[PDB]
């Protein structure tokens, strides 16, 4: 029989976790304890509730939903950052937060971990505007309901959603789970809205040969990378994918053109875009960044807006149409259009310019270490982006299929590359897993370097040392950009404590040259038994010219004055 | 080509509206211009938002889905309330809210018509609480998703919804509607729980012969009281509705035992409900009312819960089950379960006991206004019955299969019945429609009257005149118990404005006795140009028995002191 | 000893209510009947919740402050319309609702009156976007300091406040409340920076002689009336009021030039302002209607902002300065300045140009009307103007000095002005109060003037039945402008019900012409038992010259297209 902490674990399991992580508070040891009887899947402790968040949510990356289980008000409200970030980058997090006993409510009763009054809703109140559900349980019997409903929630909406149990009803009897399968259910496609969604976007570039494909990051929250490739082979056009989007499409793939960013595009592609009939955007989001201070937006009279469950073609809008379904369908359908892919060819625009092999024992520079990393590249490899120079180094690389590249370009939280890189490598133990953060981020987060040590994850860790070099420093410049240096390799040896009462196996190495960072390289990959972080040591202001002409770009538009 | 309003106006065509409700303000004339460019639908006006909201309740109730359209802040604030009263009875009423020209945000400008800050997020937050979605438009190119989403989520969650858009925007283009077919679009049930939950209710009631069925409030939500009669013709077992229920089963069915609520039960069937060996209860409420304050809750160990969207029976519970399905599914495999049934009959408990025909001449009664108005229903019929001993009065009557009772037994808003009468009658003009209000209930939403007259609705007033006469004024008496006396009758020429601008053919008659009430019938029915008010006088304390039983367990669980914690 | 009923109710007494409005439910009686154990003040019925609001909103304009007392969910809803209204109009009004037995929380209890759902702070959640202050109280110890807190916020903020009560604690003992005048304790102005403020504005009119008094509509709310005059007395200046500030500055004063409002201010006085050389605003609002859709906004570079508990001069705030103390203090020091008030004079632009005495037997019209209306004033009077029309007769009456205008003019809900006027009537009975209302507007809350009835409030009323005619006819014309014609003045005989359970004093009477008006208003004035209603009949597009410039800049305002970003 279940208790309602079970009931939880069951629905967990069910939706394919084999791990959910915690941080133990006295408002949740006991829902912790009915956690850990089900065996199917592992408890993960962090550090603290923001990395438990971002731990949760670069699980999710991994395995395509994560659960994170905190304490009240001390464990939940940090939490919510990761939360919303979760929202942000389209991410099913389950948050699940303890909650004062049920008999304190409406007595008259202040509790520790509270804001010293007496009522205690206070809390969902907030869960409300960063989640897609956000349930209180305070009796057994509601418990099943209410668990069902967030977890069927988020997985449909692929959004974050939020629990909170009370503390003394976790072991009490509730009502058993049925079948997984009721939790994935969802409707299907409209079919006539999918039949005239296909058709009306047949009509739309029948008179418009040169059609660019533009892959979006929302294309793996609509479950929908399998069904672009059909959708490109049959169509023979042009692709291009967006900032956020790196790895959503085989870059093998010989339709494939490269990145389209505005005036930090691959050579050829900002041209191809412009001169395009009909762009076909797959599950795409504009904003600030992706439009480049909104001077790159592409133009409303050649667009085919596919979004994950709807589509707006030849001015009329089709909801309920699932992008899955659409691009199958439309592979089935369409006809040849090459016209955007041989313009492309036609441009002899050429490959991405890239640095040749540094002389081993030169200074490091920027391009020297993005071009061992992408040495490192392989099918099975799985890149860590930290927001800074590292989104454009990782931008800049030529990806083998089945590579992938984790961003976080929406909510753009410094720091949530290292939880992040963690929770995503308890998730995928089987690849080769790449962080690539700066000396200033990586401070944020860095203690959960030690869960890596503690759980033996075989992280490879390139910190950036250019002493807090960032492009504010060269475009917005003050005393705020510049930080307390550490001595990062030796942050291993810390976290390892080794001759004390545990043990780990981690390794942090320094790389001031070409030739260090490649010995550095393979110590890294030999050590299987723990992360291993490479401090590598460049000089300031040198960092990519793409982070400097999107920077001027994005900077001019946050600050531009008011408007009448 | 269209625009924002012109959108909002076809989506609203397409989930089947004829009408929709408006009261006009400033900020949400032009958006009434656009939904007027549409021809398929027409735009009913209200006095005032809060009755323009359980107009659209009342419409809702008759044709599955309303709208109501008000202004910012002023207009939006009351209507929340009859959007509350949506949402608690479960019924998808689509609140359009004028706003802000879209040039005043975060621009340091003070507007009229709201609370003297420069900001205008107040009432979207508001509005969040008492709705399944809620949306403000801004600009034109967000329109059309903001519009599908919450006209989706009202038709699948049967909730009420919100929206407002920005006064300068109603005008502006924007894309084109797709199909109607994906604004109805909703999952399946999932083939697994469904099977499961079937076979799971096979197995509970194996050895459990005596097998009641109880039928529930949400059961017409959950669009399957056509699969509830299948469901019991295939069982053979005892059939009883709970109180808010009324209608959503057949009462010349076979099976059909009656009410069951406690003490107040029809003959027989609290035996019968005690008896059983399992309950089956499809899509109930049980809150202080339906369990009569506490003193009738199902029995956990006997209890099947169907729900509109999951089944939780033999301590297993299954989400994604639609009511619907189950309810077929199980239709198919089901034995004859007779037991509780026979049951039943073997009480011989006899009919509900009601009063003969009385004297014409003598002063006219509750129970003889019960009885004239009962001889009315006939398969075309809907009564709309306020809350108070209308609620009993209606109860107790013998439906003929077709006939309706509308209830608001969750919400329980005094004064909701004379605006839902108004918004049932026009989305229902081919019925018989027929109020049952008590005099103080009437007073609260009164002059909704007067749009039964403009439209020449010819709905049936029974207005019942105790002076203000209810069960607090027994159970828990007070100076706050009183009310003005009206003459009601004489409110119909009021309305009707003869010899004025305009006119209208609404009567008010009184009846002092059942003679008097029977001519005054006679006339109502004849009356095919508008409305028709019967004011009834009866003496205080002349209720139901059902309503003095029933009202004394809920005051004393209402007023039960704290339990220290 | 205190139960936290009477608790509250020696608190508001304590205010200096000797009245408060209720609306019974079942949440609420017990607290109802504890507030009735205090004999130092009545309690007062109403229809419904809206109007109980509203009822409150104009008694507080009489007394100060004001209290309403309704019941969980279905009550309070409607009610946060009329406490939008408060906050919006400044006004103290404490909004008490009863709420669930406390029994009944983290309990999985569905409660009736409620969404459907298990918890119940929806309502409070809710209260707080238009409160001051919101608190919910469960416990019977929490009750005194929840209580003070409100009724202290709301004095001191001049804004209304919300209590929940849960229905089983009422009646329960708690501590007793202390001396009253805890509730008014305040912060006096910080005495640095009131010097400063006043030295600032000294040196900002030094070489500025043209200097002109802007009064508005925070004016009483910062309890400056007196104080404005001492200091305009002072000053020699130009004195012109802000409309929304009708009355708040004696017309008979000397310096006293008249309404200033864009392109309908009084003549001259357009001119003056725009020549001043200085303003000093007292506690103003500009929105877009008091600047005629942002056409009549005040030089940034002359003007003095003096807010209630703040002033802005010469490019420095000063926060902790109460607009009573800087004028007081002003007074005392400021030299003489006539600049702008001898040159308003050198205009010569006349006084407002009126109507002379109608033909008695010609058709009535608008002007008529107005004329005879400001012929009841007296230092004795109160007018209350809703919003339409009825605005700009009032604002083109000459007051004797003491007699009062009341205006709704930020919130601006139709229909207002008649449950406002009842609460006003109940709050100042020694006044003769008089209410303009126009036809559309009086349908929404209509039934409040039963209670007028009831309590036998001598209300005079004129009706203006130009057949819905708005100033929206002629510049947005649309079906959604037409109303259902009423026999307004039959209405008062149905109020009145006159040979039924109670009896009624109220007058109806129809006047279609100058000489029908004057005898109507005879009547009126004789009749001290009871409200009389007077329905004017005059034509479509008839109205005063002001609205039609005033309503197209509005209308223009409102529509402007978005700026694109």
Not at 109 to 121: E, I, R, S
């Amino acid at each position: 029989s279940y208790t309602v902490g079970t009931y939880l674990a069951e629905r967990l399991v069910q939706i394919g976790l084999k791990h959910h992580f915690a941080v133990a508070g006295d408002y949740n040891l006991v829902l912790l304890d009915n956690l850990l009887l089900n065996k199917n899947m592992e408890q993960v402790y962090c550090c603290n509730e923001l990395n438990c968040g971002f731990s949760a949510e670069g699980y999710a990356r991994a395995k395509g939903a994560a659960a994170a289980v905190v304490t009240y008000s001390v464990g939940a409200l940090s939490a919510f950052d990761a939360i919303g970030g979760a929202y942000a980058e389209n991410l099913p997090v389950i948050l699940i937060s303890g909650a004062p006993n049920n008999n304190d409510h409406a007595a008259g009763h202040v509790l520790h971990h509270a804001l010293g009054k007496t009522d205690y809703h206070y809390q969902l109140e907030m869960a409300k505007n960063i989640t897609a559900a956000a349930e209180a349980i305070y009796t057994p019997e509601e418990a099943p309901a209410k668990i069902d409903h967030v977890i069927k929630t988020a997985l449909r909406e692929k959004k974050p959603v939020y629990l909170e149990i009370a503390c003394n009803i976790a072991s009490m009897p509730c009502a058993a789970p049925g079948p997984a399968s009721a939790l994935f259910n969802d409707e299907a496609s409209d079919e006539a809205s999918l039949n005239a969604a296909v058709e009306e976007t047949l009509k739309f570039i029948a008179n418009r040969d040169k059609v660019a494909v533009l892959v979006g990051s929302k294309l793996r929250a609509a479950g929908a990378e399998e069904a672009a490739v059909k959708f490109a082979d049959a169509l023979g056009g042009a692709v291009a994918t967006m900032a956020a989007a790196k790895s959503f499409f085989p870059e093998e793939n010989p339709h494939y053109i490269g990145t389209s960013w505005g005036e930090v595009s691959y050579p050829g592609v900002e041209k191809t875009m412009k001169e395009a009939d009909a762009v076909i955007a797959l599950a795409p989001v504009f904003n600030d960044y992706s439009t480049t201070g909104w001077t790159d937006i592409p133009d409303p009279k050649k667009l085919v807006l596919a979004e994950p469950r709807s589509v707006v073609v030849n001015g009329i809008r089709f909801p309920s149409v699932h992008l899955k379904d659409y691009l199958t369908r439309l592979a089935q359908k369409v006809s040849k259009k090459t016209g955007a892919l041989d313009f492309f060819k036609s441009l002899n625009a050429g490959e991405l310019k890239k640095a040749a092999p540094a002389d081993p024992s030169a200074p490091l520079v920027n391009a020297e270490i993005a071009r061992q990393v992408e040495a490192l590249l392989t099918p099975n490899t799985t890149v860590i982006a930290e927001t800074g120079d590292s989104w454009f180094n990782a931008q800049r690389m030529k990806l083998p299929n089945g590579a992938r590249v984790e961003y976080e370009m929406q909510w753009g939280h410094i720091g949530w590359s290292v939880p992040a890189a963690f929770g995503y490598a308890v998730g995928a133990p089987e690849r080769r897993n790449i962080l690539m953060v700066g000396d200033g981020s990586f401070q944020l987060t860095a203690q959960e370097v030690a869960q890596m040590v503690r759980l033996k994850l075989p992280v490879i860790i390139f910190l950036i040392n250019n002493y807090g070099y960032t492009i504010e420093v060269m475009i917005h410049d003050g005393p705020y950009n510049n930080i307390k240096n550490w001595d990062y390799a030796g942050l291993m040896e810390v976290f390892n404590g080794n001759g004390g009462y545990d043990s780990g196996a981690g390794k942090g190495l320094k790389a001031k040259t070409g030739g260090e960072l490649a010995e550095a390289i393979k110590v890294a990959l030999a050590n299987t038994d723990g992360p291993t972080l490479i401090e590598c040591f460049i000089g300031r202001e040198d960092c990519t010219e793409e982070l400097v002409k999107w920077g001027k770009r994005v900077a001019a538009a946050n600050s531009r004055k008011p408007v009448n």
